[PDB]
């Protein structure tokens, strides 16, 4: 079975390339701008 | 005297040879965050 006529058919194709370059700061998140919380979070270590 | 957060660089023999503040210059804050005195090219994020 040999084709006798054709058809050109555009087909979209979507791909993600990047997400939103977020960024999180400990001392502002973990601590509500308090200082004692900053002392404790400094006591925990190098998580930030 | 002020309430600071210094970074004391000891030596082979065992005494504090050099140090860097953590509020003197933004580059000093950069060294204070990177935890060394070798800050290569590039944008760093130190504080808020």
From Swiss-Prot, chain B:
Residues of this chain annotated as glycosylated in UniProt: 13
Segments for region (Putative superantigen): 11-32
Cysteines joined through disulfide linkages: 22-32
Top-rank taxon, per record: Viruses
UniProt subunit comment: Binds to host ACE2. RBD also interacts with the N-linked glycan on 'Asn-90' of ACE2. Cleavage of S generates a polybasic C-terminal sequence on S1 that binds to host Neuropilin-1 (NRP1) and Neuropilin-2 (NRP2) receptors. Interacts with host integrin alpha-5/beta-1 (ITGA5:ITGB1) and with ACE2 in complex with integrin alpha-5/beta-1 (ITGA5:ITGB1). May interact via cytoplasmic c-terminus with M protein. May interact (via N-terminus) with host bilirubin and biliverdin, thereby preventing antibody binding to the SARS-CoV-2 spike NTD via an allosteric mechanism.
Role noted for this protein: Attaches the virion to the cell membrane by interacting with host receptor, initiating the infection. The major receptor is host ACE2. When S2/S2' has been cleaved, binding to the receptor triggers direct fusion at the cell membrane. When S2/S2' has not been cleaved, binding to the receptor results in internalization of the virus by endocytosis using host TFRC and GRM2 and leading to fusion of the virion membrane with the host endosomal membrane. Alternatively, may use NRP1/NRP2 and integrin as entry receptors.
Protein name per UniProt: Spike protein S1
């Amino acid at each position: 079975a040999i084709p006798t006529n054709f058809t050109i058919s555009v087909t979209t194709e979507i791909l993600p390339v990047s997400m939103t370059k977020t960024s999180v700061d400990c001392t502002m998140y973990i601590c509500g701008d308090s200082t004692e919380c900053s002392n404790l979070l400094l006591q925990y270590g190098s998580f930030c | 005297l002020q309430p600071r957060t210094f970074l004391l660089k000891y030596n082979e023999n065992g005494t504090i040879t050099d140090a860097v503040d953590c509020a003197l210059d933004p580059l000093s804050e950069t060294k204070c965050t990177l935890k060394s005195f070798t800050v290569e090219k590039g944008i760093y994020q130190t504080s808020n």
